[PDB]
């Protein structure tokens, strides 16, 4: 029985021919005050998973601690911890989805929406969502909060169905993700211009880009808008 | 102050004549000629533009007016009276018909509405 | 829903309708409202479907256990009280049930106990429960006689349900009848109210205001 | 408390090949109590039919209001109102009470006497018009009717076939609604003739 | 509902979807949300359907009367001020969210009006439950000095974003193009991308299937 | 504020200087967290040299400004050019007398030859306060300190544009309900100048 | 709510209406006549909210009595009922709505047939063989549905109402103190003083 | 306040044939007006020739299905690999459901398979465990649109023999898997036309003595 | 609430308790005995909430019967009542309180005097000549206060209870379907089968 | 915040600089509009060189600091001096695990020889954020702009005292829930210095 205080907005992601990409801005809002500008909401787990989290930040920080523990505890009496018995995206997801649902069933949820993006050991892309209610779903594109409304329509024009995944390159995917992030800075009042993006590819592995900024914005047309109807000057 | 004229200005004279109506008809008699002719596939209404000076721009004074996209009017008599009757007719076409039935009124009914406006000016105070 | 059970010369007549509704939506026209606890005891479902179904099937188990322990058939008084006492433990939690526990034992004779989620346990000769109960009672009260034949009794129960199915929006579908004797209960069929209404009308001459 | 669920009832109209059909059930109830099995919800002003579902006092009031208005119309205009025109009259009449509406769901069905084109329309309680070329459903079993109609309907049926279709759409939709049924009536409407048939159905 | 308005070099285009809903049910699979206020001033409306048709027809009516009185072609700023003062008077109770666009003697215009009475001017606007999906597109592909052809596609694509991604929108796309020197061209069902596949079976019943109790003739004429 | 109506959020201020007065504002309107319009014009003209910055309800402020514009046009036709004090009074009358149904925080700024530049702030209650400069809008809370520290009377145009520009960028920085471009309207004897500053400029200052 | 039942037999309409008036914790009167004669061949019974009930009934009577005099004629039962329905339907969206349910039993001298109309507080009118308001129907309709016949005599109707009242006295929780029964036929309206035991 | 429940839309349908049974469900997962996935399977093969779908709040549906599949695993363990019969699966599910009587699994569950005589079987449950064996049952959002249709086309309700004055009911012949699938597809395309939460895809699981077979058809995406 | 009256005459205690059980819209039973014999010379009548009523009654009976056997003695009525009071006073601040009002009429074989105890659901015990629970007293106390005398015979109490029941049947709104009367004296507890008419 | 309990309101901040970190705070507590204590100390010592600025509920923050002081005293006895990051974690564990019943906005500031000065802010939800400086308390809203514009990393003691002195006076100026004297605690290698500034000084800056 709680209410979120410091919050993170959208986490968007989509899967492409050889991997998945996920991004989330670096803001931690306190209501309408864009309070903290250096919050990383993308959490890499090992070298094959990135968990993006929106929602309550104190709870995200808790989920972070939990993930670091899973890694420590999986290395225990595990000679193959950095190989065959390393944490897979599907393991990290199922674990989180379990916690989320248990917490909702005790009426004390972790006020978050999470997307686990990654690549399985056999090459399969993994992209799955889980939120404060334990609800889970998978799709070629996944976005939380505001991004579900504005990013999905855009990312879906690139990958509308399963067959479209093998026809999409990292270049195309990253371009779409980057554009969605710009649209969100335009229309989401709780967004930040600074963001992070992560690509998990079956060949090149994990590439994590920090300190990205929305660029190439169109604001010039504003010079010609005056009044709200009849004003001429 | 106030319109204390709440009585009729048109009343029956001993011979059964409605004075003001007969005099209004005389005003109409001194007006420019207007006519209308009904054909099988149309109607034509016409009148002369009695411009009261050559410095006036005769086009800025329309004697033939559109009431609805399928109805037109012309007159003979006092121009200003016609002008206000046209405004009222265009309006009633909307208030008593288009805003109710979604279509413009048929000629006879619009005619009937203008006529009522004129009758009341013959009895109201 | 309309369920009834009455006591007479040849046993017990248990009759119920079979409609279930969620708001104005008719969820089923084929609900089983009589739970066959065991071959000798019957229970009627009214109130919460799950509640009745669950606790009465469980009752069926507690009765079996009693018979294994005591080597004697369970009495309707004890059976009903098992249910009733259970229901009372959960009082205030939200269970919803109005049921008749019917049985015919050597020691007691035909016996009907009305048991509800409030904790009430009542022995009686005639009970009707459900949204259509008032209609069923009219018919029941005016034609009930202790000396009814097993054929006329079955009909009365059937007719009473019909009366309720016609007027109560929440009752209808079909009528399920049961005759409870000392050697066990006998099922007397499933009758579609659609077809039954027309038959009763022509044969009996009732429902005159209805055109057909 | 939901005025549109107190009395119960449904109406459906369909268009066919040079015909339309409008049908309704006959129940009038008070919550769970069936009260009348003779409550027709289809009325006609000349050759225009109007079915109305909803709160019964308003259904009765509206029929009376439209009879009044169509009677005066006929006198002034010297001709019977057409379906397209009446539809606009219903809509404007409903929106006039925008903030204290009649709790009804009207449905218009008829054939234009000049052009012969079949016509049906539906409205929400404040007048919004739905001019469909296929079917219109209204009532406490509107979801059910939509389900029935979307599957059973096919364009250009002859009067004899539309009858079966609309009848089945109606009948089966009503049997899944607690507040509908207790009888049904179907009108098959053609340029020249209108046939009215009462259906046999369950009475529970 | 998804409605958009896009301004182009010598005109304006508005478009909308055609699904009408009552809760989760599609009451009308092809309603018209593009209303004519005057020959060259059209308005797209979202919200309460009866309200968007009512407020539009009323102002359109008064605009028609204003034009005949002044002998001038109607202006969008007039429909705009009239619509907004009416909507403000009713404090939001008339649920009309509109995109009013048109051409008049002073040029081409595009404005939006929210139910409470506020207006906005822009080069591209969207409203409706599908507003966000459409705006995501408009924000991705709009550029200044669009041609008529580019604006029709842009506005058309935005509506598609809503049709596909908003459950509150669907069916077809209606467009109305208002170009400075030409007659307004209303393109009803410009795009129809949701045709139902043929049913797997025919449900035509054999005659006699339905049980009839009484049959009789209805007397129409007096 | 009515449930669901468009809000102006805003970071608006009006600052008087040697040559006259400058009005500034952001350009974001919101319905919750959605930015309904990212390029609004909150600087409204009620008379040639009398403008206002609007904050609160978008509908209310438009309605009010539309009526003040009308009252001033009629005033002008009959009695000549109105003073800023008169424009503020008309605004006040409407805001005060209808306090129960409106959410409007309006800053009125204007230029006259006798009075130079003037600023009047009409806060939520309908009270009127004449000040050297005024800030309002939801983003204003964040610049109370900055503005009180940096404002000086009789600054130059260049300096005032800078002050307004820095203040609003901070306001826009912290307030989610503020954003877009920074618009300014300079009112002096010379005339009326419209300025606009884009994100890329103000964001990193 | 009070008990109001009506049954239209072959040549008359019988209205049976409960005799109690209960206010809170005590039964104030046990001889109340919940009926007003509207015209010599039309009677209306009523049940509902405390004062509204009689105020409405007396207003309808006054109005029908006025019509009869202005016109020197007695309106048909159908006409009286439509008038009553319109009045009830007016109050539903009024400042303070009349909460009165009525049964109108009348004998149409012209058609030569008795008629019963049931109209609830909302103006919902329906013509029926038998009817009731409130909960009354819940107990009695099954009996009426079963035993009713259109060609019943006045005595057969009375016997049926008796059975109906017996079921009400057995299963209905409140003591309504019996019913006053009235018959409306070609000869007018008469009170059957024999029902406490028949 | 925190609300532990949600509504993920969806519609499922189970129809028992003479020697087969089908359990179909759409593939769309929604939240309010957004589509969460166009392909998120809702009907599952639980082993032992039993198919199940717990439709409603997807988190509870997921949990219940996970618990039942596990019940099947332990039944084998605890009872020497004995095959869990459909009637036994049903009763067991009743207990799972009723176990949460005071904090219900907000789902309408349906399981299909074959009984011990090899005849088709469908069982449907209340969110708290009331269950009954049925002929056909639609569940979820468009249940109200599908059910009346099945009553007419599967159980032949209201249909009579042409010529008999509605005195002889149409004889109850039993449908083949091929005809049932036609009804299922039609039930779904019709529902898709009128319910905004139904669409995207339809996945049907068919069960016969030979096992569980899957079929998939696309549905409109608006 | 049901009717529970008690009257203590010279050599006995009479308890009158209504016979109806009403659940919602219908009267389910018209022959209910709202009393339990606690010991051969002690009886308790009860009224209140649906299930709590018989559950509490049978619990107290079970407990008194256990005391009787462990000890081979019958507790005095005063003792039985203090035990009942403490049980009621326990539940008042419980998770879910018993909402049962009881009257205990007993004959004390040691003092050779009849006694009547009235205890409400809160555990408020008072010993009186006559008592009742709920509304019953509102109608009957003016009669008892008037006609009551300490030296009445059993037959005099029965006639007074009859007058009481008549007033209740006249002025009380619900049909409680009559009363079952029981007399507690030196020879035990007997049910007076003659009260429907005496 | 519970009905009627003492509130800290406050204008508190912690700023790191070259030599270490400085904590500052106003000194007003209130119950409604009554100033319950006009000279409170919001700078609380949880360890020799680990302090905190408290805001929110007076009761809660005292309870929490009291417990932290204990945890760190026991930690010290067993494992030696605790890092500021450790002191923050303890504060966080308490603030987060008990978020439903507390109202504690705490700023933790401490000095270590290996890490120099450090600042951690624990806002209402119990999340932890490390920063060069932090501001909190009800008065903090008014100086977001001023502080962002004037803070520089690696300032000198003299400069940092001035920055904190100016910011808080502004905060105190605008916030009715802040006032009194300004208290500072300088944490460096040299030791612990306590500074206090009165109204007659800070008010006219
Ligand atoms: Mg409906
Ligand atoms: Mg039905
Ligand atoms: Mg029924
Ligand atoms: Mg901002
Ligand atoms: Mg088995
Ligand atoms: Mg759909
Ligand atoms: Mg869509
Ligand atoms: Mg202060």
PDB file of N, CA and C and ligand atoms in Angstrom, chain E residues 19, chain H residues 28 191-199 220 222, ligand 6:
ATOM      1  N   UNK E  19     -14.438   5.038 -36.687  1.00  0.00           N
ATOM      2  CA  UNK E  19     -14.999   4.154 -35.663  1.00  0.00           C
ATOM      3  C   UNK E  19     -15.680   4.948 -34.545  1.00  0.00           C
TER       4      UNK E  19
ATOM      5  N   UNK H  28      -4.555 -11.040 -28.814  1.00  0.00           N
ATOM      6  CA  UNK H  28      -4.329  -9.666 -28.394  1.00  0.00           C
ATOM      7  C   UNK H  28      -4.347  -9.487 -26.872  1.00  0.00           C
ATOM      8  N   UNK H 191     -16.739 -10.928 -33.686  1.00  0.00           N
ATOM      9  CA  UNK H 191     -16.420 -10.265 -32.442  1.00  0.00           C
ATOM     10  C   UNK H 191     -15.412  -9.173 -32.698  1.00  0.00           C
ATOM     11  N   UNK H 192     -14.468  -9.423 -33.586  1.00  0.00           N
ATOM     12  CA  UNK H 192     -13.453  -8.435 -33.894  1.00  0.00           C
ATOM     13  C   UNK H 192     -14.025  -7.169 -34.496  1.00  0.00           C
ATOM     14  N   UNK H 193     -15.079  -7.329 -35.276  1.00  0.00           N
ATOM     15  CA  UNK H 193     -15.741  -6.205 -35.908  1.00  0.00           C
ATOM     16  C   UNK H 193     -16.370  -5.284 -34.907  1.00  0.00           C
ATOM     17  N   UNK H 194     -16.923  -5.845 -33.843  1.00  0.00           N
ATOM     18  CA  UNK H 194     -17.613  -5.045 -32.850  1.00  0.00           C
ATOM     19  C   UNK H 194     -17.026  -4.843 -31.455  1.00  0.00           C
ATOM     20  N   UNK H 195     -15.949  -5.528 -31.117  1.00  0.00           N
ATOM     21  CA  UNK H 195     -15.354  -5.344 -29.805  1.00  0.00           C
ATOM     22  C   UNK H 195     -13.932  -4.853 -30.013  1.00  0.00           C
ATOM     23  N   UNK H 196     -13.592  -3.717 -29.413  1.00  0.00           N
ATOM     24  CA  UNK H 196     -12.259  -3.153 -29.604  1.00  0.00           C
ATOM     25  C   UNK H 196     -11.108  -3.936 -28.989  1.00  0.00           C
ATOM     26  N   UNK H 197     -11.426  -4.853 -28.091  1.00  0.00           N
ATOM     27  CA  UNK H 197     -10.409  -5.640 -27.427  1.00  0.00           C
ATOM     28  C   UNK H 197     -10.155  -6.957 -28.109  1.00  0.00           C
ATOM     29  N   UNK H 198     -10.931  -7.273 -29.126  1.00  0.00           N
ATOM     30  CA  UNK H 198     -10.748  -8.520 -29.832  1.00  0.00           C
ATOM     31  C   UNK H 198     -10.139  -8.254 -31.193  1.00  0.00           C
ATOM     32  N   UNK H 199      -9.061  -8.963 -31.505  1.00  0.00           N
ATOM     33  CA  UNK H 199      -8.412  -8.806 -32.794  1.00  0.00           C
ATOM     34  C   UNK H 199      -7.012  -9.380 -32.831  1.00  0.00           C
ATOM     35  N   UNK H 220      -8.275  -8.818 -37.786  1.00  0.00           N
ATOM     36  CA  UNK H 220      -8.013  -7.411 -38.055  1.00  0.00           C
ATOM     37  C   UNK H 220      -7.246  -6.757 -36.929  1.00  0.00           C
ATOM     38  N   UNK H 222      -7.022  -3.381 -36.160  1.00  0.00           N
ATOM     39  CA  UNK H 222      -7.464  -2.050 -35.737  1.00  0.00           C
ATOM     40  C   UNK H 222      -8.176  -2.095 -34.382  1.00  0.00           C
TER      41      UNK H 222
HETATM   42 MG1  LIG K   6     -11.816  -5.586 -32.543  1.00  0.00          MG
END
